[PDB]
Amino acid sequence: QRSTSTPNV
Amino acid sequence: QRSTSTPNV
Amino acid sequence: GAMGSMERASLIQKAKLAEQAERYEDMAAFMKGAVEKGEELSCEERNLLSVAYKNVVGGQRAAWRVLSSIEQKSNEKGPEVREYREKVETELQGVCDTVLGLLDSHLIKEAGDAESRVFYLKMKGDYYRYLAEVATGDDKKRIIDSARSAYQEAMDISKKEMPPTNPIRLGLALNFSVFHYEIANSPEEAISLAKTTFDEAMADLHTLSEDSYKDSTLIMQLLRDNLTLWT
Amino acid sequence: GAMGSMERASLIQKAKLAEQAERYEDMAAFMKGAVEKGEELSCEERNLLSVAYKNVVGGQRAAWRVLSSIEQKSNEKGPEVREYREKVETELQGVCDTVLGLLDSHLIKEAGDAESRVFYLKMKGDYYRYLAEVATGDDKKRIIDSARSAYQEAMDISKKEMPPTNPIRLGLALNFSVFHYEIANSPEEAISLAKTTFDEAMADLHTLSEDSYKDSTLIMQLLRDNLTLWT
Ligand SMILES: *CC(=O)N1CC2(C1)CN(S(=O)(=O)c1ccc(C(F)(F)F)c(F)c1)CCO2
Ligand SMILES: *CC(=O)N1CC2(C1)CN(S(=O)(=O)c1ccc(C(F)(F)F)c(F)c1)CCO2
Ligand SMILES: [Cl-]
Ligand SMILES: [Cl-]
Ligand SMILES: [Mg+2]
Ligand SMILES: [Mg+2]
Ligand SMILES: [Mg+2]
Ligand SMILES: [Mg+2]
């Protein structure tokens, strides 16, 4: 599983 | 609500 | 055309890759290139063409409805909502014109079998229906009649040449019923067509293998869903 | 540029319309046009720019991963998988080069406040990181160092100028930790950064209003999610 980066608001 | 047409397979 | 230098088989292979990658604009360009090789399309290739352009125009239709709703509510913010709705509308019309162009040059005239001819005529009805969804001026009535005429020709062939459970026949009847209800202001014709199609398909399910049964009953459930919504 | 004739305010209004319509390529073109008007961007305008290009490049990254996986498994079908992966890769690189071009001409040099300067430097790190994800040749190491250098400058400013709960500071630390783990082969640095960031933010939550609390704790949960995955 890939790491989570900052999402869109 | 809108009618349903043929979907993609 | 930008795909004139690529092999037909390579275009088809890349259309399948683009579908897996959810790159439907690419997939549509690849299948446009395949059609323009001039050979007739198989059943699987017609599916690739259909999936690609349905996804592209579906995104445009969804965007147009959002913008048209904002525009209707605003009618002061200036011309920007109308301008941007017009921009999306023109792009949508361009895609429909492209598909209708492929069908008229020369997919339909070379289509002699029932499955190919009915599928392409259904397509022609569908993309005129999408043009009708955004049409307003002195062209709306002629666009609606072009859709009707394509669907009617497809229906006449399908009733003579396919069983009532054939999925192309069923999807055509579904979409023609949506045309009647949403476009032609004929809800009673839509309901009648949906009910008759459903009932005749029910009576023919016993002839099908398990795999064909799955396909027919899926579209029949959509006819039922609409009948529930319409009544 | 195709948006040179449109008012800045009209470009921003249309970017917001495109977001509502999920037309992110349009939204990116509108915000590129807004940036090229030469004025600095507000916090809300930076958000529009960020949302537009993140969605565009996110779709390209997702497609590239699908195609790269198919290509890796195939390594006989001919050159088509490599060719189409290269096509998507080149388009992805073009988008990253466009964003990096906007930042270098002249968003970063005109950014004097902490929030603007840290946000733009984080952006620069992010789009070099996306270039690094597809880089292989004699350029991969230099691309990685460009990402590191942008993130590090952003971190140095954010630690001097923002509280540990500031959402820009938090999102920067999150993305730099992903850089360490996924790109720089430094999982221990990633874990250390994530843990320290989380713990310092926890200790500063008491200073926040309910609305800022919601924003800070969202990114902190992502730091926790990654720590769970990494350990
Ligand atoms: C063989 C052939 O010519 N085909 C396959 C084809 C064209 C079928 N059409 S369709 O008739 O529009 C259709 C769509 C969806 C479904 C399903 F499975 F969802 F129920 C269906 F059975 C038929 C679409 C393109 O592919
Ligand atoms: C004010 C300003 O300069 N902004 C708002 C901004 C840029 C924040 N960034 S972000 O720092 O990347 C960020 C992303 C997501 C979230 C959230 F809400 F999901 F948690 C966040 F708090 C900050 C993105 C663009 O907009
Ligand atoms: Cl516009
Ligand atoms: Cl290609
Ligand atoms: Mg008023
Ligand atoms: Mg118009
Ligand atoms: Mg073998
Ligand atoms: Mg390359």
Side-chain angles (χ1 to χ4, degrees), chain D residues 152-208:
Chain D
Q152 188 59 58
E153 182 165 0
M155 304 268 324
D156 293 336
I157 297 169
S158 75
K159 298 225 235 182
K160 296 179 170 143
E161 299 293 335
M162 298 149 147
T165 51
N166 180 281
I168 294 161
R169 180 169 165 182
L170 284 174
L172 162 67
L174 179 61
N175 286 12
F176 198 16
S177 73
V178 170
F179 169 83
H180 286 310
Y181 190 92
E182 296 288 353
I183 307 296
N185 188 48
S186 309
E188 289 176 339
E189 187 75 15
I191 290 164
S192 183
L193 178 56
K195 282 200 182 115
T196 287
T197 303
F198 183 94
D199 287 347
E200 280 200 288
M202 181 84 21
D204 189 69
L205 288 178
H206 76 275
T207 68
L208 303 186

Short mmCIF file of all heavy atoms in Angstrom, two decimals, chain D residues 152-208:
data_model
loop_
_atom_site.label_atom_id
_atom_site.label_comp_id
_atom_site.label_asym_id
_atom_site.label_seq_id
_atom_site.Cartn_x
_atom_site.Cartn_y
_atom_site.Cartn_z
N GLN D 152 13.28 21.20 2.08
CA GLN D 152 14.08 21.63 3.22
C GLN D 152 13.97 23.13 3.45
O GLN D 152 13.87 23.59 4.59
CB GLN D 152 15.55 21.24 3.04
CG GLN D 152 16.39 21.50 4.29
CD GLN D 152 15.87 20.73 5.49
OE1 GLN D 152 15.78 19.50 5.44
NE2 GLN D 152 15.50 21.44 6.56
N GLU D 153 14.04 23.91 2.37
CA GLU D 153 13.85 25.35 2.52
C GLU D 153 12.48 25.67 3.10
O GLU D 153 12.37 26.54 3.99
CB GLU D 153 14.02 26.07 1.17
CG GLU D 153 13.87 27.59 1.32
CD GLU D 153 14.37 28.39 0.12
OE1 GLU D 153 14.85 27.78 -0.86
OE2 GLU D 153 14.28 29.64 0.18
N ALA D 154 11.44 25.01 2.61
CA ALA D 154 10.10 25.21 3.15
C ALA D 154 10.05 24.84 4.62
O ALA D 154 9.46 25.57 5.43
CB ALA D 154 9.08 24.39 2.35
N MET D 155 10.66 23.71 5.00
CA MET D 155 10.67 23.34 6.42
C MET D 155 11.38 24.37 7.27
O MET D 155 10.93 24.69 8.37
CB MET D 155 11.27 21.96 6.66
CG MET D 155 10.60 20.88 5.87
SD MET D 155 9.28 20.21 6.92
CE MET D 155 10.00 20.27 8.55
N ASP D 156 12.53 24.88 6.80
CA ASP D 156 13.27 25.82 7.62
C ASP D 156 12.43 27.07 7.91
O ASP D 156 12.41 27.57 9.04
CB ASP D 156 14.59 26.20 6.94
CG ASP D 156 15.58 25.03 6.85
OD1 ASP D 156 15.49 24.08 7.66
OD2 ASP D 156 16.46 25.09 5.97
N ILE D 157 11.74 27.58 6.89
CA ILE D 157 10.88 28.75 7.09
C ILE D 157 9.71 28.40 8.00
O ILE D 157 9.38 29.16 8.92
CB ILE D 157 10.40 29.30 5.73
CG1 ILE D 157 11.60 29.78 4.90
CG2 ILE D 157 9.40 30.43 5.95
CD1 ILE D 157 11.23 30.10 3.45
N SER D 158 9.06 27.25 7.76
CA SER D 158 7.85 26.93 8.51
C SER D 158 8.14 26.76 10.01
O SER D 158 7.32 27.12 10.85
CB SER D 158 7.19 25.67 7.94
OG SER D 158 7.90 24.50 8.31
N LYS D 159 9.30 26.20 10.35
CA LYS D 159 9.63 26.02 11.76
C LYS D 159 9.95 27.34 12.44
O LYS D 159 9.74 27.47 13.64
CB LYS D 159 10.81 25.05 11.90
CG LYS D 159 10.52 23.64 11.35
CD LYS D 159 10.99 22.55 12.32
CE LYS D 159 11.94 21.57 11.64
NZ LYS D 159 12.38 20.47 12.57
N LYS D 160 10.44 28.32 11.68
CA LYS D 160 10.73 29.63 12.26
C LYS D 160 9.51 30.53 12.31
O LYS D 160 9.44 31.43 13.16
CB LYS D 160 11.82 30.34 11.48
CG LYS D 160 13.16 29.66 11.50
CD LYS D 160 14.16 30.44 10.68
CE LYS D 160 15.57 29.91 10.87
NZ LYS D 160 16.32 29.97 9.58
N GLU D 161 8.53 30.32 11.42
CA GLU D 161 7.52 31.34 11.20
C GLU D 161 6.09 30.89 11.46
O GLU D 161 5.21 31.75 11.57
CB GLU D 161 7.60 31.88 9.77
CG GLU D 161 8.93 32.53 9.43
CD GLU D 161 9.18 33.82 10.19
OE1 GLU D 161 8.21 34.49 10.62
OE2 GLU D 161 10.37 34.17 10.36
N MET D 162 5.82 29.59 11.55
CA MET D 162 4.46 29.13 11.77
C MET D 162 4.38 28.28 13.03
O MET D 162 5.36 27.65 13.42
CB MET D 162 3.89 28.28 10.62
CG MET D 162 3.77 28.99 9.28
SD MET D 162 3.97 27.80 7.95
CE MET D 162 2.88 28.51 6.74
N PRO D 163 3.21 28.24 13.67
CA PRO D 163 3.01 27.31 14.78
C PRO D 163 2.97 25.87 14.27
O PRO D 163 2.67 25.64 13.09
CB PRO D 163 1.65 27.74 15.35
CG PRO D 163 0.94 28.31 14.19
CD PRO D 163 2.00 29.03 13.40
N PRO D 164 3.25 24.90 15.14
CA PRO D 164 3.30 23.50 14.70
C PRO D 164 1.98 22.95 14.20
O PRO D 164 1.99 21.89 13.56
CB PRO D 164 3.77 22.73 15.95
CG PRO D 164 4.06 23.73 16.99
CD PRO D 164 3.61 25.08 16.56
N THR D 165 0.85 23.61 14.47
CA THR D 165 -0.46 23.18 14.00
C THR D 165 -0.88 23.84 12.70
O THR D 165 -1.95 23.50 12.16
CB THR D 165 -1.53 23.48 15.04
OG1 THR D 165 -1.41 24.85 15.43
CG2 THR D 165 -1.37 22.58 16.25
N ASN D 166 -0.10 24.78 12.18
CA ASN D 166 -0.47 25.43 10.93
C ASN D 166 -0.66 24.38 9.83
O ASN D 166 0.22 23.55 9.62
CB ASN D 166 0.61 26.43 10.54
CG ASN D 166 0.28 27.15 9.26
OD1 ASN D 166 0.46 26.59 8.18
ND2 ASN D 166 -0.21 28.38 9.36
N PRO D 167 -1.80 24.38 9.13
CA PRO D 167 -2.05 23.29 8.16
C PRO D 167 -1.06 23.25 7.01
O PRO D 167 -0.76 22.17 6.51
CB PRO D 167 -3.48 23.58 7.68
CG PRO D 167 -4.12 24.30 8.85
CD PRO D 167 -3.02 25.15 9.43
N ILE D 168 -0.54 24.40 6.58
CA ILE D 168 0.48 24.38 5.53
C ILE D 168 1.75 23.72 6.04
O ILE D 168 2.34 22.88 5.36
CB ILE D 168 0.74 25.81 5.02
CG1 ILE D 168 -0.51 26.36 4.33
CG2 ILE D 168 1.90 25.80 4.02
CD1 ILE D 168 -0.52 27.86 4.20
N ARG D 169 2.18 24.09 7.25
CA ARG D 169 3.33 23.43 7.88
C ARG D 169 3.11 21.93 8.01
O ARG D 169 4.02 21.14 7.74
CB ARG D 169 3.59 24.05 9.26
CG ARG D 169 4.79 23.42 9.98
CD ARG D 169 5.22 24.21 11.21
NE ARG D 169 6.11 23.41 12.05
CZ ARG D 169 6.62 23.82 13.20
NH1 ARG D 169 6.36 25.02 13.69
NH2 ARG D 169 7.40 22.99 13.89
N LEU D 170 1.91 21.52 8.44
CA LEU D 170 1.61 20.10 8.63
C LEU D 170 1.60 19.35 7.30
O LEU D 170 2.13 18.24 7.20
CB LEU D 170 0.26 19.94 9.33
CG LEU D 170 0.23 20.23 10.84
CD1 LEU D 170 -1.21 20.18 11.38
CD2 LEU D 170 1.13 19.27 11.63
N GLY D 171 0.95 19.91 6.28
CA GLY D 171 0.91 19.24 4.98
C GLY D 171 2.29 19.14 4.35
O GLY D 171 2.59 18.16 3.67
N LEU D 172 3.12 20.16 4.56
CA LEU D 172 4.51 20.10 4.12
C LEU D 172 5.25 18.96 4.80
O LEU D 172 5.94 18.17 4.14
CB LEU D 172 5.19 21.44 4.40
CG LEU D 172 6.71 21.42 4.40
CD1 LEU D 172 7.24 21.14 2.99
CD2 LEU D 172 7.22 22.75 4.92
N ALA D 173 5.14 18.86 6.13
CA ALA D 173 5.83 17.78 6.84
C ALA D 173 5.33 16.41 6.39
O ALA D 173 6.13 15.49 6.19
CB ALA D 173 5.66 17.96 8.35
N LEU D 174 4.01 16.26 6.25
CA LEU D 174 3.46 15.03 5.68
C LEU D 174 4.10 14.68 4.34
O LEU D 174 4.59 13.56 4.14
CB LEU D 174 1.94 15.16 5.52
CG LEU D 174 1.19 13.95 4.91
CD1 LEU D 174 1.39 12.72 5.80
CD2 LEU D 174 -0.30 14.26 4.75
N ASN D 175 4.13 15.64 3.41
CA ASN D 175 4.64 15.31 2.08
C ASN D 175 6.15 15.07 2.08
O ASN D 175 6.63 14.21 1.35
CB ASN D 175 4.27 16.40 1.09
CG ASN D 175 2.80 16.36 0.73
OD1 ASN D 175 2.01 15.67 1.38
ND2 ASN D 175 2.43 17.09 -0.31
N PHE D 176 6.89 15.81 2.91
CA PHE D 176 8.33 15.54 3.02
C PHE D 176 8.57 14.15 3.61
O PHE D 176 9.49 13.44 3.19
CB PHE D 176 8.97 16.66 3.86
CG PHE D 176 10.48 16.80 3.73
CD1 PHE D 176 11.19 16.21 2.70
CD2 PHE D 176 11.18 17.55 4.66
CE1 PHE D 176 12.58 16.37 2.60
CE2 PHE D 176 12.57 17.71 4.58
CZ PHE D 176 13.27 17.12 3.54
N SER D 177 7.72 13.72 4.56
CA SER D 177 7.89 12.36 5.08
C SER D 177 7.61 11.31 4.01
O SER D 177 8.28 10.28 3.96
CB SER D 177 7.02 12.13 6.34
OG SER D 177 5.62 12.00 6.05
N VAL D 178 6.62 11.56 3.14
CA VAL D 178 6.37 10.65 2.02
C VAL D 178 7.56 10.65 1.07
O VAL D 178 7.98 9.59 0.59
CB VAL D 178 5.06 11.04 1.29
CG1 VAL D 178 4.88 10.26 -0.03
CG2 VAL D 178 3.84 10.78 2.21
N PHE D 179 8.13 11.82 0.80
CA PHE D 179 9.36 11.89 0.01
C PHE D 179 10.44 10.98 0.59
O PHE D 179 11.08 10.20 -0.13
CB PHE D 179 9.85 13.34 -0.06
CG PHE D 179 11.25 13.48 -0.61
CD1 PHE D 179 11.46 13.49 -1.99
CD2 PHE D 179 12.33 13.61 0.23
CE1 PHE D 179 12.77 13.63 -2.51
CE2 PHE D 179 13.63 13.74 -0.28
CZ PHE D 179 13.83 13.75 -1.65
N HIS D 180 10.67 11.07 1.91
CA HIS D 180 11.73 10.28 2.53
C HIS D 180 11.46 8.79 2.36
O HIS D 180 12.38 8.00 2.07
CB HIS D 180 11.85 10.62 4.03
CG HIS D 180 12.49 11.95 4.31
ND1 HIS D 180 13.69 12.34 3.75
CD2 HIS D 180 12.10 12.97 5.12
CE1 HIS D 180 13.99 13.55 4.18
NE2 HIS D 180 13.06 13.95 5.03
N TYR D 181 10.21 8.37 2.54
CA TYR D 181 9.89 6.95 2.55
C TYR D 181 9.83 6.37 1.13
O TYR D 181 10.40 5.30 0.86
CB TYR D 181 8.54 6.72 3.25
CG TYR D 181 8.27 5.26 3.52
CD1 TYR D 181 8.65 4.68 4.72
CD2 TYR D 181 7.67 4.46 2.55
CE1 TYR D 181 8.42 3.33 4.96
CE2 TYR D 181 7.45 3.12 2.78
CZ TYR D 181 7.82 2.57 3.99
OH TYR D 181 7.59 1.23 4.23
N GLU D 182 9.14 7.06 0.23
CA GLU D 182 8.84 6.51 -1.08
C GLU D 182 9.91 6.82 -2.12
O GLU D 182 10.08 6.04 -3.07
CB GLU D 182 7.48 7.04 -1.56
CG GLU D 182 6.28 6.61 -0.68
CD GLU D 182 5.92 5.13 -0.83
OE1 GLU D 182 6.50 4.45 -1.70
OE2 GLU D 182 5.05 4.64 -0.06
N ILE D 183 10.63 7.92 -1.97
CA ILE D 183 11.53 8.42 -3.01
C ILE D 183 12.99 8.27 -2.61
O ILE D 183 13.81 7.77 -3.38
CB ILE D 183 11.21 9.89 -3.36
CG1 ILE D 183 9.73 10.06 -3.71
CG2 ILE D 183 12.19 10.41 -4.43
CD1 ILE D 183 9.27 9.32 -4.96
N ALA D 184 13.33 8.72 -1.40
CA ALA D 184 14.72 8.83 -0.97
C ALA D 184 15.24 7.59 -0.26
O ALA D 184 16.38 7.61 0.22
CB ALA D 184 14.90 10.04 -0.05
N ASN D 185 14.44 6.54 -0.15
CA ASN D 185 14.83 5.28 0.49
C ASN D 185 15.33 5.52 1.91
O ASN D 185 16.31 4.93 2.38
CB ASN D 185 15.87 4.53 -0.37
CG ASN D 185 16.16 3.13 0.15
OD1 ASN D 185 15.23 2.37 0.45
ND2 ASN D 185 17.43 2.77 0.22
N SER D 186 14.64 6.41 2.63
CA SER D 186 14.99 6.77 4.00
C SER D 186 13.78 6.58 4.92
O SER D 186 13.23 7.55 5.44
CB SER D 186 15.47 8.22 4.07
OG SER D 186 16.49 8.49 3.12
N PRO D 187 13.34 5.34 5.13
CA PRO D 187 12.15 5.14 5.98
C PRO D 187 12.35 5.64 7.41
O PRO D 187 11.39 6.12 8.02
CB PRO D 187 11.92 3.63 5.93
CG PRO D 187 13.20 3.03 5.45
CD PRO D 187 13.89 4.06 4.62
N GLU D 188 13.55 5.53 7.96
CA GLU D 188 13.73 5.99 9.33
C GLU D 188 13.60 7.51 9.43
O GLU D 188 13.02 8.03 10.40
CB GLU D 188 15.07 5.50 9.87
CG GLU D 188 15.03 3.98 10.11
CD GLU D 188 16.34 3.38 10.56
OE1 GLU D 188 17.41 4.00 10.34
OE2 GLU D 188 16.29 2.29 11.17
N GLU D 189 14.11 8.25 8.44
CA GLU D 189 13.90 9.69 8.43
C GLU D 189 12.42 10.02 8.28
O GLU D 189 11.92 10.95 8.92
CB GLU D 189 14.72 10.33 7.30
CG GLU D 189 14.71 11.84 7.28
CD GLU D 189 15.59 12.45 8.38
OE1 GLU D 189 16.41 11.72 8.95
OE2 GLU D 189 15.46 13.68 8.63
N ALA D 190 11.70 9.27 7.44
CA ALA D 190 10.26 9.49 7.26
C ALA D 190 9.50 9.30 8.57
O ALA D 190 8.66 10.12 8.95
CB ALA D 190 9.71 8.55 6.19
N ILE D 191 9.76 8.18 9.25
CA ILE D 191 9.10 7.88 10.52
C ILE D 191 9.43 8.94 11.56
O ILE D 191 8.54 9.44 12.26
CB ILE D 191 9.50 6.47 11.00
CG1 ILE D 191 8.88 5.41 10.09
CG2 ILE D 191 9.11 6.25 12.47
CD1 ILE D 191 9.52 4.03 10.24
N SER D 192 10.71 9.29 11.68
CA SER D 192 11.11 10.31 12.65
C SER D 192 10.41 11.63 12.39
O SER D 192 9.90 12.28 13.32
CB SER D 192 12.63 10.50 12.62
OG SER D 192 13.01 11.44 13.62
N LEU D 193 10.40 12.07 11.13
CA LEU D 193 9.73 13.33 10.81
C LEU D 193 8.24 13.25 11.13
O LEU D 193 7.67 14.18 11.71
CB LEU D 193 9.95 13.68 9.34
CG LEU D 193 9.26 14.97 8.86
CD1 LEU D 193 9.65 16.20 9.70
CD2 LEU D 193 9.56 15.21 7.38
N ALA D 194 7.60 12.14 10.76
CA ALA D 194 6.17 12.02 10.99
C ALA D 194 5.85 12.05 12.49
O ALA D 194 4.90 12.73 12.91
CB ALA D 194 5.63 10.73 10.36
N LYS D 195 6.63 11.31 13.30
CA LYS D 195 6.37 11.24 14.74
C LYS D 195 6.59 12.59 15.41
O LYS D 195 5.75 13.06 16.19
CB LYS D 195 7.29 10.20 15.40
CG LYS D 195 6.90 8.75 15.23
CD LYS D 195 7.61 7.93 16.32
CE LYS D 195 7.31 6.44 16.21
NZ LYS D 195 8.54 5.66 15.89
N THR D 196 7.72 13.24 15.12
CA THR D 196 8.00 14.55 15.70
C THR D 196 6.94 15.58 15.32
O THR D 196 6.47 16.35 16.17
CB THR D 196 9.41 14.99 15.27
OG1 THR D 196 10.37 14.20 16.00
CG2 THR D 196 9.64 16.47 15.52
N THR D 197 6.56 15.62 14.04
CA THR D 197 5.52 16.54 13.59
C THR D 197 4.21 16.29 14.33
O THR D 197 3.57 17.23 14.82
CB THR D 197 5.30 16.37 12.09
OG1 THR D 197 6.54 16.60 11.40
CG2 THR D 197 4.24 17.35 11.56
N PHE D 198 3.81 15.02 14.43
CA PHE D 198 2.56 14.69 15.11
C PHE D 198 2.61 15.15 16.56
O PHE D 198 1.67 15.80 17.05
CB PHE D 198 2.30 13.18 15.02
CG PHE D 198 1.00 12.75 15.65
CD1 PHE D 198 -0.15 12.63 14.88
CD2 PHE D 198 0.91 12.45 17.00
CE1 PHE D 198 -1.34 12.24 15.44
CE2 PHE D 198 -0.29 12.06 17.57
CZ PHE D 198 -1.42 11.95 16.79
N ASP D 199 3.71 14.84 17.26
CA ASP D 199 3.78 15.13 18.69
C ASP D 199 3.80 16.62 18.95
O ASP D 199 3.19 17.10 19.91
CB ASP D 199 5.01 14.44 19.29
CG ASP D 199 4.84 12.93 19.40
OD1 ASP D 199 3.69 12.44 19.25
OD2 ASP D 199 5.84 12.23 19.65
N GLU D 200 4.50 17.39 18.13
CA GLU D 200 4.51 18.83 18.35
C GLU D 200 3.16 19.46 18.04
O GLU D 200 2.78 20.46 18.68
CB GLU D 200 5.61 19.50 17.53
CG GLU D 200 6.99 19.40 18.11
CD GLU D 200 7.90 20.46 17.53
OE1 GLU D 200 8.29 20.35 16.35
OE2 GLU D 200 8.22 21.43 18.26
N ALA D 201 2.45 18.92 17.06
CA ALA D 201 1.12 19.44 16.75
C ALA D 201 0.15 19.12 17.87
O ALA D 201 -0.63 19.98 18.29
CB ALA D 201 0.63 18.87 15.42
N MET D 202 0.17 17.88 18.37
CA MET D 202 -0.65 17.53 19.52
C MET D 202 -0.51 18.54 20.65
O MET D 202 -1.51 18.98 21.23
CB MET D 202 -0.31 16.12 20.02
CG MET D 202 -1.17 15.71 21.20
SD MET D 202 -2.80 15.01 20.83
CE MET D 202 -2.56 14.51 19.19
N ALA D 203 0.72 18.93 20.96
CA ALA D 203 0.95 19.79 22.11
C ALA D 203 0.48 21.22 21.89
O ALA D 203 0.41 21.98 22.86
CB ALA D 203 2.43 19.78 22.49
N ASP D 204 0.12 21.59 20.65
CA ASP D 204 -0.30 22.95 20.31
C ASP D 204 -1.78 23.02 19.96
O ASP D 204 -2.29 24.12 19.69
CB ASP D 204 0.58 23.47 19.17
CG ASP D 204 0.38 24.96 18.86
OD1 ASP D 204 0.75 25.83 19.68
OD2 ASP D 204 -0.07 25.26 17.73
N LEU D 205 -2.50 21.90 20.00
CA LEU D 205 -3.91 21.90 19.63
C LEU D 205 -4.74 22.77 20.57
O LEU D 205 -5.78 23.30 20.17
CB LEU D 205 -4.46 20.48 19.63
CG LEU D 205 -3.99 19.58 18.49
CD1 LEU D 205 -4.59 18.22 18.72
CD2 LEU D 205 -4.40 20.14 17.13
N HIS D 206 -4.31 22.90 21.83
CA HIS D 206 -5.09 23.62 22.83
C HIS D 206 -5.23 25.10 22.49
O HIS D 206 -6.11 25.77 23.05
CB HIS D 206 -4.46 23.43 24.22
CG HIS D 206 -3.23 24.25 24.44
ND1 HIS D 206 -1.97 23.82 24.05
CD2 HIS D 206 -3.05 25.46 25.01
CE1 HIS D 206 -1.08 24.74 24.37
NE2 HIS D 206 -1.71 25.74 24.95
N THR D 207 -4.40 25.62 21.60
CA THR D 207 -4.42 27.04 21.26
C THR D 207 -5.44 27.38 20.18
O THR D 207 -5.68 28.57 19.94
CB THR D 207 -3.04 27.50 20.78
OG1 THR D 207 -2.75 26.90 19.51
CG2 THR D 207 -1.96 27.15 21.80
N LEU D 208 -6.04 26.38 19.55
CA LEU D 208 -6.81 26.55 18.33
C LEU D 208 -8.30 26.73 18.60
O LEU D 208 -8.84 26.24 19.59
CB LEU D 208 -6.62 25.34 17.41
CG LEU D 208 -5.17 25.07 17.05
CD1 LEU D 208 -5.09 23.98 16.03
CD2 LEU D 208 -4.49 26.35 16.55
#
